[PDB]
Structure formats: C-alpha cells, structure tokens
Amino acid sequence: VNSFSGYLKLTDNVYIKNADIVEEAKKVKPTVVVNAANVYLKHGGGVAGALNKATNNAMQVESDDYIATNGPLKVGGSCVLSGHNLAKHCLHVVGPNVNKGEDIQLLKSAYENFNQHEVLLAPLLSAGIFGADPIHSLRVCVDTVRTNVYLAVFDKNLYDKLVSSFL
Ligand SMILES: O=C(Nc1ccccc1)Nc1ccc(C(=O)N[C@@H]2c3cccc(O)c3C[C@@H]2C(=O)O)cc1
C-alpha cells in the first residue's frame, strides 16, 4: 500500500493522474521523483524548470556541481541526485528531444532507467517541450517499465486523450 491518491490504473504496474508533478511531489514526498532532464542538467523549462523552481534553485546548484565533476549525461541515460523538498531522490532521466533531432528509439532506453527503482512519480518522458507524441511515450512506458510508476500529466485535455486512446 502506498500514499498515491486518485490514480487511474492502466496496467498491473502503471498508473496515471491529471496532476501537477510539483504539487504531487510536495504532497506525497515520494522516494523517487523523475525529472525530464537534458544532458547538461540545465533545468530551464518544462517539467525540469518547474521542479527546479520549486526547490528554490537548489536542484540547479547541485546539478551544476554534478556536471562539473562528471560531465554530461547520455541521451537515454540518468543520474540519481537529491530530491530536495520534493522527494527523497530525484532521478534525472534524459529522453530524446525531437526538437533537437534525437533518435526516438532512445525513448525505450530512457524508460529502462525507471526499472532500477521500485516506485516512482514521473512525467511522460520526451513529452511536452521535448516534442515527442505523448501517446507514443505512454505506450513505450507501459511496454518498458516493470516497476510501479505513477504518471502525472499536467494538461487535463491531454490526460483525457491519453486515457481515451489507451490500448
Ligand atoms: O511549474 C509547475 N508547478 C509549480 C512550479 C513552481 C511552483 C509551484 C508550482 N508545474 C509544471 C510546469 C510545466 C510542466 C510541463 O511542462 N508539462 C509538460 C506538458 C504540457 C503540455 C503537454 C505535454 O505533453 C506536456 C509534457 C509535460 C508534462 O505534463 O509532464 C509541468 C508542470
């Protein structure tokens, strides 16, 4: 039993809710919140900018030290950093950014990072300003992630479409 409320169950392990991931993180304080990161961990917009803002820029400060030590992530890769005031941990996952021409097949590799964590609060990878089709992203999520994932979808119109079109 966990503390996530109001989710629709899509499969054995995938749940979805129309919610602001920042507000959901602030209320649940999950073990892991997933960030829609880029390889530089520059949290300027989209989910990343919102999560970083909610940490009063502490996420960005920690991220800049991580990059200075380790260099950029790979597209499809991830790193575990602090969750600050939002979660125990933040899993920064780099989905491909279609608006940069990155290979959409890397989306499956990106979702594979979720399997290293038993339970996660997460956005749809590569959705929003990353330019992928969120319906495709949801399909890859369901077909790749085997651990328990609670997806927060900010846009109500998109949430309903995602639900209504889900196979
Ligand atoms: O800024 C906050 N919250 C907040 C921050 C500071 C203080 C208080 C509250 N939230 C927030 C901001 C942006 C996003 C976001 O870009 N969504 C994306 C979106 C939008 C439309 C269609 C989409 O396919 C997607 C993908 C992504 C998502 O829905 O996952 C999501 C959440």
Swiss-Prot record:
Assembly and binders: May form homohexamers. Interacts with N protein.
Subcellular location: Host endoplasmic reticulum membrane
Macro domain ranges (all copies): 1-167
Means of activity regulation: Inhibited in vitro by GRL-0617.
Gene coding for it: rep
Name this protein carries in UniProt: Papain-like protease nsp3
Main function: Responsible for the cleavages located at the N-terminus of the replicase polyprotein. Participates together with nsp4 in the assembly of virally-induced cytoplasmic double-membrane vesicles necessary for viral replication. Antagonizes innate immune induction of type I interferon by blocking the phosphorylation, dimerization and subsequent nuclear translocation of host IRF3. Also prevents host NF-kappa-B signaling. In addition, PL-PRO possesses a deubiquitinating/deISGylating activity and processes both 'Lys-48'- and 'Lys-63'-linked polyubiquitin chains from cellular substrates.
Catalytic activity of the protein: Thiol-dependent hydrolysis of ester, thioester, amide, peptide and isopeptide bonds formed by the C-terminal Gly of ubiquitin (a 76-residue protein attached to proteins as an intracellular targeting signal)
Record annotation: effect of changing residue 164 to L: In strain: Gamma/P.1
Residues of the full protein shown: 1025 to 1191 of 7096
Topology of the protein relative to the lipid bilayer: Multi-pass membrane protein
